[PDB]
Amino acid sequence: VVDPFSKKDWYDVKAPAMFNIRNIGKTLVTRTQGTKIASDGLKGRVFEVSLADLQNDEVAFRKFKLITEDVQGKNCLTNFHGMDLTRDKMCSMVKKWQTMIEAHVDVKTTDGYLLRLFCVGFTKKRNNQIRKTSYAQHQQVRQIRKKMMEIMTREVQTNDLKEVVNKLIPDSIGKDIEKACQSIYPLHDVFVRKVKMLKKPKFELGKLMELHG
Amino acid sequence: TKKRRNNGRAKKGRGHVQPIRCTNCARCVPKDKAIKKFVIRNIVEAAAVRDISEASVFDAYVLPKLYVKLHYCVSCAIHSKVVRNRSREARKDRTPPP
Amino acid sequence: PIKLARVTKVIGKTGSQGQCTQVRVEFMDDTSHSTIRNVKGPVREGDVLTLLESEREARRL
Amino acid sequence: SLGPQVAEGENVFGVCHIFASFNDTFVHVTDLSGKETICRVTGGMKVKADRDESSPYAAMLAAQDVAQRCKELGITALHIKLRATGGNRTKTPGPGAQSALRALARSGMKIGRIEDVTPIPSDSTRRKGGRRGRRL
RNA sequence: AGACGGACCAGAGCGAAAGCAUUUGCCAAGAAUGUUUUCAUUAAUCAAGAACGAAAGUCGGAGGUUCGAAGACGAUCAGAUACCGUCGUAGUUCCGACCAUAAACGAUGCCGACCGGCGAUGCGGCGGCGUUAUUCCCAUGACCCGCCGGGCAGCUUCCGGG
RNA sequence: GUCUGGCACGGUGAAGAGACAUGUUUUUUCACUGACCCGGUGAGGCGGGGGGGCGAGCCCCGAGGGGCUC
Ligand SMILES: [Mg+2]
Ligand SMILES: [Mg+2]
Ligand SMILES: [Mg+2]
Ligand SMILES: [Mg+2]
Ligand SMILES: [Mg+2]
Ligand SMILES: [Mg+2]
Ligand SMILES: [Mg+2]
Ligand SMILES: [Mg+2]
């Protein structure tokens, strides 16, 4: 019997232009036999990859998703699909004798991209503190959740996804949410977690290339 | 004969509490019984550390940990040799060891 | 993949009867690499073994 | 021409997808996407009896076989992704994870980015056993 | 598609008890504190009688992932119509009516006074050096230091009992 | 009576793959409508187009025009 790998082809994947390192690892496809074309069976893969290896000056505990959408000449040009945090870190933040806050939202950016955002924060222990606990009351928490949703909506209903990702990479959304709420409680540890993308418009090829150029 | 004053469970002023399930036993016990334990172990365990870090690709690669919460039965615990019986006066210490 | 190793120090007996013993060794070809193994018979510090399974990484028995 | 980008330093990434547990152990090399597979291997395909499937020995043999079939294609580096049974079970790794991983390194596969992946359900369905569990 | 609401979860809170945990919005109740407001003994406990009452269970509809009394098999066993493993019915889920039991335990009736200390924790009110806060100095927590009320508990003793 | 295979009524075009033997027809799939069939109506405003303009958003933009989406 013939080994089933001899009839395959190594292609390359290519990232957008918002990222410094645009050249990542490779993938492989089968050749064209009647129907079941390579480019079609190749369209839709999702390359989970960290962020340090795209920039090499940035944090390591984040992940981007980077679906592929089009192909031309053995190079698969991708688009944004999602964001995600890393678990070792998340479980590390969740500690005890303190309080944890969460929030979420849905918003539609300037284009037809609809996406669902998530946020998280932990209360703080002042450096002279003794009472061991650092809990909150339920009311002032409602303010903070409310304050999260305002800030995200304000930032996101203004821009179309080139600006937005350039905020996400050095996440300024949460650094500002920190700054706002420190007159209620401090919230030393804050992040944007997950940026799943619920709906997307059609494929406009001219939009993609000028983004990827 | 009350062997304990707490009755073995840190309720003190509720009426009812939720249950959990032993991680080994699989039985249904409250959350105030059911010994707790927390694991912050590494992933490679002190033996293959040198081998990896020399066969890596990065530069010294801080090498994450692994986090778990554990629940045990009272029965399954003593058999696991976590805790042990005590004498009368020493039952009254709420301190863990170093 | 037959190998050699000298002994460094003896840790303790083991087994159901106290017949096997725990030791620590270096492979006589590289000095940094090291393992711990179970042996049978009277074994003293200063010895040399003929290992076949070059790696087991045994533990308390 | 398997990864014909010949520079002798352009390392070729894959992922390994170790699923360890009791009674079994799997080693499933794939590409960056997890859609295309390269020599999935187990512990039951090597040993004879059924009560020694989940031993570190059978794990070590599997990786040696996988590494062989992997270096025959130009795949040099890997990312590791570890898994336990999860769901509503132990959700701690089994006694084949340590042994397999170490046998890849010492065979030579230039690894980076070892991480865990496991379900961790929030408060999912009722576990088997029946309120007193197995009373052996 | 239907269930469940992890870690944060504590000898922490609420409720007459049973019991109560994702977000938001709505509806109507309540304790404690604060009070130089008001009525003026209107109260405590209670046969008969009346509301509520875990799980199982019964009745009529909708639904039926997971688990699983019955039930069938494979093993261990001198034997096992059990402990173990695989399947799997009633039920477990919601809507509307029945029943009124539990180690329903603080195994400790309700009301009221009196009787020793200590450090904490949760709510409200009163104050004080200082730090941050925020955006230029204030009223918000956060701590720092005390006080007062009525709460869930805790350590110590020749109070005194047994 | 009923299930099923074949010939005729049976037309247009495009992709994929064959047996012989070095093109033949065959075929699986996609689409079309003009035979055929179905429903509705007192056979009552279908499609393109710009003479439309009450307006909007996308381009050039003499800010006046016309191009696109409606
Ligand atoms: Mg009770
Ligand atoms: Mg009565
Ligand atoms: Mg009931
Ligand atoms: Mg019922
Ligand atoms: Mg019924
Ligand atoms: Mg079953
Ligand atoms: Mg009774
Ligand atoms: Mg009684």
mmCIF file of N, CA and C (backbone and C1' of nucleotides) in Angstrom, chain A residues 94-100 102 104 126 128-131 133-135 137 140 142 145 179 182-186, chain E residues 6-11 22-25 120-124 130-135 140-145:
data_model
loop_
_atom_site.group_PDB
_atom_site.id
_atom_site.type_symbol
_atom_site.label_atom_id
_atom_site.label_comp_id
_atom_site.label_asym_id
_atom_site.label_seq_id
_atom_site.Cartn_x
_atom_site.Cartn_y
_atom_site.Cartn_z
ATOM 1 N N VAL A 94 -7.063 33.987 40.759
ATOM 2 C CA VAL A 94 -8.143 33.614 41.651
ATOM 3 C C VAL A 94 -7.509 33.162 42.948
ATOM 4 N N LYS A 95 -7.565 34.030 43.937
ATOM 5 C CA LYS A 95 -7.064 33.773 45.267
ATOM 6 C C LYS A 95 -8.235 33.889 46.225
ATOM 7 N N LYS A 96 -7.929 33.849 47.506
ATOM 8 C CA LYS A 96 -8.915 33.693 48.547
ATOM 9 C C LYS A 96 -8.753 34.814 49.555
ATOM 10 N N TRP A 97 -9.825 35.054 50.294
ATOM 11 C CA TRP A 97 -9.951 36.212 51.165
ATOM 12 C C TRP A 97 -9.879 37.493 50.346
ATOM 13 N N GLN A 98 -10.609 37.499 49.241
ATOM 14 C CA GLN A 98 -10.852 38.701 48.468
ATOM 15 C C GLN A 98 -12.070 38.456 47.592
ATOM 16 N N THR A 99 -12.359 39.424 46.740
ATOM 17 C CA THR A 99 -13.591 39.479 45.979
ATOM 18 C C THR A 99 -13.265 39.524 44.499
ATOM 19 N N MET A 100 -14.124 38.909 43.698
ATOM 20 C CA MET A 100 -13.935 38.812 42.262
ATOM 21 C C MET A 100 -15.144 39.386 41.553
ATOM 22 N N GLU A 102 -16.941 40.472 37.677
ATOM 23 C CA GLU A 102 -17.004 40.095 36.277
ATOM 24 C C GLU A 102 -18.101 40.880 35.580
ATOM 25 N N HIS A 104 -19.803 41.658 31.220
ATOM 26 C CA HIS A 104 -19.768 41.387 29.795
ATOM 27 C C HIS A 104 -20.744 42.306 29.084
ATOM 28 N N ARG A 126 -4.518 46.890 50.789
ATOM 29 C CA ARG A 126 -3.622 48.000 51.069
ATOM 30 C C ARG A 126 -2.428 47.543 51.889
ATOM 31 N N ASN A 128 -0.757 48.496 54.351
ATOM 32 C CA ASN A 128 -0.740 48.601 55.805
ATOM 33 C C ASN A 128 -1.865 47.813 56.456
ATOM 34 N N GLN A 129 -2.499 46.927 55.710
ATOM 35 C CA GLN A 129 -3.779 46.365 56.089
ATOM 36 C C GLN A 129 -3.622 45.135 56.962
ATOM 37 N N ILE A 130 -4.636 44.903 57.795
ATOM 38 C CA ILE A 130 -4.594 43.877 58.828
ATOM 39 C C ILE A 130 -5.829 42.985 58.794
ATOM 40 N N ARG A 131 -6.949 43.510 58.310
ATOM 41 C CA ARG A 131 -8.238 42.850 58.457
ATOM 42 C C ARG A 131 -8.390 41.611 57.577
ATOM 43 N N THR A 133 -9.222 40.471 54.825
ATOM 44 C CA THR A 133 -10.379 40.033 54.057
ATOM 45 C C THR A 133 -10.617 40.839 52.792
ATOM 46 N N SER A 134 -10.777 42.145 52.902
ATOM 47 C CA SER A 134 -10.854 43.028 51.744
ATOM 48 C C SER A 134 -12.045 42.706 50.847
ATOM 49 N N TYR A 135 -13.185 42.410 51.460
ATOM 50 C CA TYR A 135 -14.398 42.209 50.692
ATOM 51 C C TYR A 135 -15.067 43.539 50.382
ATOM 52 N N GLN A 137 -19.110 45.472 49.372
ATOM 53 C CA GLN A 137 -20.553 45.447 49.463
ATOM 54 C C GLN A 137 -21.140 45.317 48.069
ATOM 55 N N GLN A 140 -21.887 48.966 45.645
ATOM 56 C CA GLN A 140 -20.772 49.583 44.940
ATOM 57 C C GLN A 140 -20.169 48.661 43.892
ATOM 58 N N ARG A 142 -22.182 46.946 41.867
ATOM 59 C CA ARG A 142 -23.047 47.197 40.717
ATOM 60 C C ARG A 142 -22.558 48.393 39.926
ATOM 61 N N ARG A 145 -19.475 47.106 37.669
ATOM 62 C CA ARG A 145 -19.949 46.414 36.480
ATOM 63 C C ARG A 145 -20.523 47.396 35.483
ATOM 64 N N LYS A 179 -8.101 52.744 36.289
ATOM 65 C CA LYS A 179 -7.953 54.146 36.657
ATOM 66 C C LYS A 179 -9.271 54.751 37.114
ATOM 67 N N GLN A 182 -10.637 53.368 41.006
ATOM 68 C CA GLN A 182 -9.802 53.477 42.199
ATOM 69 C C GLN A 182 -10.334 54.444 43.246
ATOM 70 N N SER A 183 -11.406 55.170 42.964
ATOM 71 C CA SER A 183 -12.102 55.978 43.947
ATOM 72 C C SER A 183 -13.323 55.275 44.516
ATOM 73 N N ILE A 184 -13.439 53.969 44.296
ATOM 74 C CA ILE A 184 -14.473 53.139 44.895
ATOM 75 C C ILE A 184 -13.764 51.998 45.601
ATOM 76 N N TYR A 185 -13.051 51.191 44.829
ATOM 77 C CA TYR A 185 -12.050 50.252 45.305
ATOM 78 C C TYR A 185 -10.913 50.162 44.299
ATOM 79 N N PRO A 186 -9.741 49.668 44.725
ATOM 80 C CA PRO A 186 -8.513 49.845 43.940
ATOM 81 C C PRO A 186 -8.418 49.015 42.673
ATOM 82 P P G E 6 -21.654 28.082 41.291
ATOM 83 O "O5'" G E 6 -20.354 27.182 41.102
ATOM 84 C "C5'" G E 6 -20.295 25.881 41.665
ATOM 85 C "C4'" G E 6 -18.969 25.208 41.409
ATOM 86 C "C3'" G E 6 -17.758 25.898 42.018
ATOM 87 O "O3'" G E 6 -17.494 25.437 43.331
ATOM 88 C "C1'" G E 6 -17.364 25.448 39.722
ATOM 89 P P A E 7 -17.216 26.463 44.531
ATOM 90 O "O5'" A E 7 -15.759 27.023 44.231
ATOM 91 C "C5'" A E 7 -14.631 26.181 44.381
ATOM 92 C "C4'" A E 7 -13.428 26.687 43.624
ATOM 93 C "C3'" A E 7 -12.869 28.037 44.030
ATOM 94 O "O3'" A E 7 -12.007 27.953 45.148
ATOM 95 C "C1'" A E 7 -12.990 27.880 41.667
ATOM 96 P P C E 8 -12.448 28.540 46.569
ATOM 97 O "O5'" C E 8 -12.813 30.059 46.273
ATOM 98 C "C5'" C E 8 -11.790 31.027 46.137
ATOM 99 C "C4'" C E 8 -12.343 32.410 45.904
ATOM 100 C "C3'" C E 8 -13.441 32.860 46.843
ATOM 101 O "O3'" C E 8 -12.923 33.392 48.040
ATOM 102 C "C1'" C E 8 -14.037 33.361 44.608
ATOM 103 P P C E 9 -13.909 33.835 49.213
ATOM 104 O "O5'" C E 9 -14.790 32.548 49.474
ATOM 105 C "C5'" C E 9 -14.643 31.864 50.701
ATOM 106 C "C4'" C E 9 -15.567 30.684 50.826
ATOM 107 C "C3'" C E 9 -15.121 29.420 50.109
ATOM 108 O "O3'" C E 9 -15.489 28.278 50.878
ATOM 109 C "C1'" C E 9 -17.230 30.060 49.304
ATOM 110 P P A E 10 -14.381 27.511 51.747
ATOM 111 O "O5'" A E 10 -13.945 28.571 52.846
ATOM 112 C "C5'" A E 10 -14.693 28.724 54.047
ATOM 113 C "C4'" A E 10 -14.217 29.904 54.845
ATOM 114 C "C3'" A E 10 -14.769 30.009 56.261
ATOM 115 O "O3'" A E 10 -13.758 30.477 57.153
ATOM 116 C "C1'" A E 10 -15.385 31.934 55.010
ATOM 117 P P G E 11 -12.943 29.422 58.048
ATOM 118 O "O5'" G E 11 -13.997 28.946 59.137
ATOM 119 C "C5'" G E 11 -14.368 29.792 60.213
ATOM 120 C "C4'" G E 11 -15.756 29.478 60.699
ATOM 121 C "C3'" G E 11 -16.302 30.358 61.806
ATOM 122 O "O3'" G E 11 -16.855 31.563 61.311
ATOM 123 C "C1'" G E 11 -16.791 28.070 62.233
ATOM 124 P P U E 22 -27.658 32.276 41.057
ATOM 125 O "O5'" U E 22 -26.692 33.314 40.345
ATOM 126 C "C5'" U E 22 -25.288 33.226 40.518
ATOM 127 C "C4'" U E 22 -24.547 33.862 39.370
ATOM 128 C "C3'" U E 22 -25.113 35.179 38.863
ATOM 129 O "O3'" U E 22 -24.653 36.286 39.615
ATOM 130 C "C1'" U E 22 -24.769 33.730 37.043
ATOM 131 P P U E 23 -25.570 37.589 39.800
ATOM 132 O "O5'" U E 23 -25.681 38.193 38.334
ATOM 133 C "C5'" U E 23 -24.529 38.694 37.677
ATOM 134 C "C4'" U E 23 -24.883 39.475 36.439
ATOM 135 C "C3'" U E 23 -25.953 40.535 36.606
ATOM 136 O "O3'" U E 23 -25.434 41.755 37.091
ATOM 137 C "C1'" U E 23 -26.440 39.212 34.716
ATOM 138 P P U E 24 -26.262 42.639 38.139
ATOM 139 O "O5'" U E 24 -27.479 43.205 37.293
ATOM 140 C "C5'" U E 24 -27.224 44.016 36.165
ATOM 141 C "C4'" U E 24 -28.437 44.167 35.283
ATOM 142 C "C3'" U E 24 -29.678 44.751 35.928
ATOM 143 O "O3'" U E 24 -29.620 46.165 36.027
ATOM 144 C "C1'" U E 24 -30.258 42.881 34.596
ATOM 145 P P G E 25 -30.566 46.959 37.056
ATOM 146 O "O5'" G E 25 -32.038 46.608 36.577
ATOM 147 C "C5'" G E 25 -32.586 47.242 35.437
ATOM 148 C "C4'" G E 25 -34.010 46.822 35.196
ATOM 149 C "C3'" G E 25 -34.973 47.019 36.350
ATOM 150 O "O3'" G E 25 -35.413 48.355 36.484
ATOM 151 C "C1'" G E 25 -35.307 44.891 35.395
ATOM 152 P P A E 120 -7.624 43.039 68.620
ATOM 153 O "O5'" A E 120 -8.261 41.873 67.756
ATOM 154 C "C5'" A E 120 -9.458 42.080 67.034
ATOM 155 C "C4'" A E 120 -9.958 40.799 66.430
ATOM 156 C "C3'" A E 120 -10.982 40.945 65.327
ATOM 157 O "O3'" A E 120 -10.391 41.257 64.081
ATOM 158 C "C1'" A E 120 -11.658 39.256 66.838
ATOM 159 P P U E 121 -11.108 42.284 63.082
ATOM 160 O "O5'" U E 121 -12.416 41.507 62.630
ATOM 161 C "C5'" U E 121 -12.307 40.245 62.001
ATOM 162 C "C4'" U E 121 -13.648 39.609 61.764
ATOM 163 C "C3'" U E 121 -14.715 40.499 61.170
ATOM 164 O "O3'" U E 121 -14.578 40.665 59.776
ATOM 165 C "C1'" U E 121 -15.632 39.229 62.927
ATOM 166 P P G E 122 -15.538 41.675 58.988
ATOM 167 O "O5'" G E 122 -16.965 40.993 59.054
ATOM 168 C "C5'" G E 122 -17.877 41.175 57.990
ATOM 169 C "C4'" G E 122 -19.303 41.224 58.466
ATOM 170 C "C3'" G E 122 -19.924 42.599 58.561
ATOM 171 O "O3'" G E 122 -20.319 43.121 57.308
ATOM 172 C "C1'" G E 122 -20.465 41.348 60.478
ATOM 173 P P C E 123 -20.200 44.694 57.021
ATOM 174 O "O5'" C E 123 -21.490 45.284 57.727
ATOM 175 C "C5'" C E 123 -22.766 44.971 57.210
ATOM 176 C "C4'" C E 123 -23.885 45.501 58.065
ATOM 177 C "C3'" C E 123 -23.854 46.976 58.382
ATOM 178 O "O3'" C E 123 -24.269 47.782 57.293
ATOM 179 C "C1'" C E 123 -24.414 45.765 60.324
ATOM 180 P P G E 124 -23.634 49.237 57.077
ATOM 181 O "O5'" G E 124 -24.222 50.087 58.282
ATOM 182 C "C5'" G E 124 -25.615 50.319 58.348
ATOM 183 C "C4'" G E 124 -26.028 51.065 59.589
ATOM 184 C "C3'" G E 124 -25.248 52.311 59.951
ATOM 185 O "O3'" G E 124 -25.580 53.452 59.187
ATOM 186 C "C1'" G E 124 -25.546 51.005 61.867
ATOM 187 P P G E 130 -1.393 64.917 61.869
ATOM 188 O "O5'" G E 130 -1.860 65.005 60.348
ATOM 189 C "C5'" G E 130 -2.618 63.972 59.741
ATOM 190 C "C4'" G E 130 -1.774 62.755 59.413
ATOM 191 C "C3'" G E 130 -1.677 62.389 57.940
ATOM 192 O "O3'" G E 130 -0.651 63.110 57.286
ATOM 193 C "C1'" G E 130 -2.234 60.463 59.192
ATOM 194 P P U E 131 -0.501 63.048 55.691
ATOM 195 O "O5'" U E 131 0.000 61.568 55.408
ATOM 196 C "C5'" U E 131 0.234 61.138 54.077
ATOM 197 C "C4'" U E 131 0.108 59.644 53.947
ATOM 198 C "C3'" U E 131 -0.460 59.140 52.635
ATOM 199 O "O3'" U E 131 0.530 59.038 51.631
ATOM 200 C "C1'" U E 131 -1.540 58.058 54.441
ATOM 201 P P U E 132 0.705 60.181 50.517
ATOM 202 O "O5'" U E 132 0.142 59.498 49.194
ATOM 203 C "C5'" U E 132 -1.209 59.653 48.797
ATOM 204 C "C4'" U E 132 -1.893 58.321 48.646
ATOM 205 C "C3'" U E 132 -2.992 58.256 47.598
ATOM 206 O "O3'" U E 132 -2.502 58.081 46.283
ATOM 207 C "C1'" U E 132 -3.802 57.350 49.607
ATOM 208 P P A E 133 -2.912 59.131 45.138
ATOM 209 O "O5'" A E 133 -4.495 58.994 45.045
ATOM 210 C "C5'" A E 133 -5.098 57.721 44.886
ATOM 211 C "C4'" A E 133 -6.560 57.727 45.265
ATOM 212 C "C3'" A E 133 -7.477 58.598 44.428
ATOM 213 O "O3'" A E 133 -7.902 57.935 43.256
ATOM 214 C "C1'" A E 133 -8.012 58.774 46.753
ATOM 215 P P U E 134 -6.973 57.890 41.950
ATOM 216 O "O5'" U E 134 -7.911 58.393 40.759
ATOM 217 C "C5'" U E 134 -9.075 59.186 40.990
ATOM 218 C "C4'" U E 134 -8.912 60.601 40.504
ATOM 219 C "C3'" U E 134 -7.550 61.223 40.785
ATOM 220 O "O3'" U E 134 -7.231 62.183 39.782
ATOM 221 C "C1'" U E 134 -9.206 62.393 41.991
ATOM 222 P P U E 135 -6.196 61.800 38.614
ATOM 223 O "O5'" U E 135 -5.439 63.167 38.302
ATOM 224 C "C5'" U E 135 -5.969 64.110 37.376
ATOM 225 C "C4'" U E 135 -6.177 65.487 37.968
ATOM 226 C "C3'" U E 135 -6.076 65.611 39.491
ATOM 227 O "O3'" U E 135 -5.486 66.859 39.843
ATOM 228 C "C1'" U E 135 -8.238 66.274 38.777
ATOM 229 P P U E 140 -18.346 60.377 53.977
ATOM 230 O "O5'" U E 140 -19.087 60.014 52.614
ATOM 231 C "C5'" U E 140 -18.410 60.071 51.368
ATOM 232 C "C4'" U E 140 -18.266 58.701 50.758
ATOM 233 C "C3'" U E 140 -17.710 57.611 51.656
ATOM 234 O "O3'" U E 140 -18.669 57.092 52.560
ATOM 235 C "C1'" U E 140 -16.701 57.484 49.512
ATOM 236 P P G E 141 -18.169 56.327 53.879
ATOM 237 O "O5'" G E 141 -16.790 55.678 53.419
ATOM 238 C "C5'" G E 141 -16.242 54.548 54.077
ATOM 239 C "C4'" G E 141 -16.125 53.372 53.141
ATOM 240 C "C3'" G E 141 -15.044 52.363 53.472
ATOM 241 O "O3'" G E 141 -15.412 51.478 54.517
ATOM 242 C "C1'" G E 141 -14.946 52.874 51.185
ATOM 243 P P A E 142 -14.760 50.011 54.632
ATOM 244 O "O5'" A E 142 -13.217 50.204 54.261
ATOM 245 C "C5'" A E 142 -12.588 49.271 53.395
ATOM 246 C "C4'" A E 142 -11.144 49.584 53.099
ATOM 247 C "C3'" A E 142 -10.178 49.706 54.253
ATOM 248 O "O3'" A E 142 -9.835 48.455 54.803
ATOM 249 C "C1'" A E 142 -9.686 51.320 52.598
ATOM 250 P P C E 143 -10.846 47.701 55.786
ATOM 251 O "O5'" C E 143 -9.949 47.359 57.048
ATOM 252 C "C5'" C E 143 -9.367 48.404 57.807
ATOM 253 C "C4'" C E 143 -8.014 48.812 57.281
ATOM 254 C "C3'" C E 143 -7.117 49.383 58.334
ATOM 255 O "O3'" C E 143 -6.574 48.341 59.111
ATOM 256 C "C1'" C E 143 -6.961 50.710 56.361
ATOM 257 P P C E 144 -6.893 48.303 60.674
ATOM 258 O "O5'" C E 144 -6.029 49.524 61.178
ATOM 259 C "C5'" C E 144 -4.707 49.685 60.700
ATOM 260 C "C4'" C E 144 -4.093 50.944 61.214
ATOM 261 C "C3'" C E 144 -4.536 51.326 62.600
ATOM 262 O "O3'" C E 144 -3.861 50.561 63.572
ATOM 263 C "C1'" C E 144 -4.606 53.218 61.210
ATOM 264 P P C E 145 -4.697 49.588 64.526
ATOM 265 O "O5'" C E 145 -5.255 50.588 65.629
ATOM 266 C "C5'" C E 145 -4.416 51.619 66.124
ATOM 267 C "C4'" C E 145 -5.159 52.627 66.944
ATOM 268 C "C3'" C E 145 -6.315 52.122 67.768
ATOM 269 O "O3'" C E 145 -5.876 51.461 68.939
ATOM 270 C "C1'" C E 145 -6.869 54.187 66.747
#
